[PDB]
Design a protein around this nucleic acid. Structure first.
Lengths: 73, 77, 76, 72, 73, 76, 77, 72
DNA sequence: TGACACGTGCCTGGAGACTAGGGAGTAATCCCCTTGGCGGTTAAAACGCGGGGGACAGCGCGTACGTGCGTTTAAGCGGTGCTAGAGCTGTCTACGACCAATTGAGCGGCCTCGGCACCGG
DNA sequence: CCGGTGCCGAGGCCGCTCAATTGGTCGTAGACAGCTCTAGCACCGCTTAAACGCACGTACGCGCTGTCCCCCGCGTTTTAACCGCCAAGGGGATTACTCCCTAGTCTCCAGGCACGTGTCA
């Protein structure tokens, strides 16, 4: 199965429950996946950039923190 | 206690990275850091989405709620 | 163009400053700078409140709309 | 006091510039409160910069620096 | 004098000459200075970020290239 | 040769950096690299402004020309 | 909505494709995707052309406006 | 005349959505040339990806990815 | 030590508060169709124990690569004054190409049938 | 070793939408001259450029330890996906109840601008 589909329907529901949402329309799930993908792409693009600057082949935890800062947490 | 499943999230992260640069290894604490940030982001977005739903006197959140929340926050929409 | 009148705007800015620090003054170009920023801020805030109003089944913006808009922005 | 100096028609004008079609009567008092908070925060930072430089005259650059760190 | 004033009027004129303009209005100079400052601020902000990631105290040539790439597009 | 003066450009670069992070020292080849990029950027901007000036049947570039060039590329 | 007609646009896409690859197939959702992008691109290009017209204190866009807009954007012609 | 299927009133309508108030008669030929170039470039990349993946079928995601990387 | 902002006078149309008044636009209310929530469940992809490697980040150190101070100075370059030359606009006259109202004519679209590959279980 | 599916390709018929005609005309092309203004010449002052010098801050490269990523057998394992009944609600139409937005009128005043003056860059 596609890897984007591993962000399962019950997982997105749980995130919404933690956000205080009581009922969730069927169209939320596809919308949430799109939003997540955009966020991930941006962060990872910066993260990999940091990795290359350090002349490494393994992205480090520190790479992500700088990526997150320049994205805005 | 992460709400998104660990293994599928990690798989997705590696897939996206391959298009920026092939043959990269992710540190475990790097993925856990990225996952904590992502889930906090989605939970926060769902908090704002819920506020938008309550604003329209609807107990059910809809795609238009997510789109409104991201537009008012200033995210590209 | 500036949308709020200079003198009432100046009085408010001077009034707030008097409570923060004693006898501080402001340059003319400083107040005009603050006013351009202020007018841009209110216009932007009014854009989001209107967007929030349209989201609801109305076209009239209400006090509750601004507070929702400011809460989601992370201000208050 | 000073917020009541800002005219009702000016806030309406601001909404027109923001592309607003109609205005509830209760917005104006609410808007005034919001405005006061914004100014306080910006001015608080502006005066902080002035004090750090050990100056007594607020400069245009002081406000701009305050504004940048507030918008950021 | 102020450090922004070190990009002198004849220097801005020379940049404009290389850009193919034959005559330059008096208001160009102040406008050009503002544009340059915005550009510089943005690049340096990223540049310094890279320096901190590498745990260095000296901004290097490599720091600038990554800053420029992300601002170049 | 770099059309911008080296030493004043370097002074400006250090000033801006000091606000982001204090006590940083710039590598020489880093400043020359930054300056080449800046001069290339300004020259390119001057090319586009001139195209806008010629478009408007003028030969003298004006602030509105610079603002148009930056707007269509997507700077502001 | 799609301001360009669907069927003639699809024919053009197929027409252009015949020169790149002989008898290559397509998908329906692929053409609709390309069209949303295409219409957004043309609308945006028309925005810049209008800015060029206004710069010259005119209100009528001319071929020189399109050519100026694409050159400053960095579009090779 | 498949290029002619992008009619004059359609291009005018696109321009209206772009904020255009007045439209020269010479715009139409110019716009068509511009459009053709755009389509060629995107499709050229799209078909390249299909051949690289040894699939021979243009997918919707291929076009979206091509379009994304074009803008960069 | 001189230039900047503070404080007050004159006034007049621009702008700001009531006072009627029509009403587009709010807010409860019912029925319905939609439509998620929840209960069962079972195969299953996630979680994990652990060997096994081992690629690779983290850390310490030598050193030379180079930045900072700073010091003089001869010298190319910026600032300022002034000038003569060229360029930025309004209202001149005009026209032609751009706008719209009207009418055949044709292609866009809804719904559907028939045939061909095609990755695939 | 054969199969359900998406595809072109066409048709039948309604069906909005073109090109073309004609007319009214808004806007755009030279332009004369008043006006700014600025590119250039000429000094004069001056701040960049540079070469040591010396002192050292530390970045880069290289080697060593670790440690944690990748891999996977593979065992078990809490659970995601699907069906289906149930009940909450989104919403569209209905209808009562406005106060919100206009005009008229009376009043308050924002700013040129000008003069007098305390204070700190």
């Amino acid at each position: 199965r596609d890897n984007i589909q591993g962000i399962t329907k019950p997982a997105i529901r749980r995130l919404a429950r933690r956000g205080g949402v009581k009922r969730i329309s069927g169209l939320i799930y596809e919308e949430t996946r799109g939003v997540l993908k955009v966020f991930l792409e941006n962060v990872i693009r910066d993260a990999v950039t940091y990795t290359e600057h350090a002349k490494r082949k393994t992205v480090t935890a520190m790479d992500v923190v700088y990526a997150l800062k320049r994205q805005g947490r | 206690e992460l709400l998104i499943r660990k293994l599928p999230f990690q798989r997705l992260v590696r897939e996206i990275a391959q298009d920026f640069k092939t043959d990269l290894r992710f540190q475990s604490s790097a993925v856990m850091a990225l996952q904590e940030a992502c889930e906090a982001y989605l939970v926060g977005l769902f908090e704002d989405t819920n506020l938008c739903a309550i604003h329209a006197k609807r107990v059910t959140i809809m795609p238009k709620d997510i789109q409104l929340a991201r537009r008012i926050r200033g995210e590209r929409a």
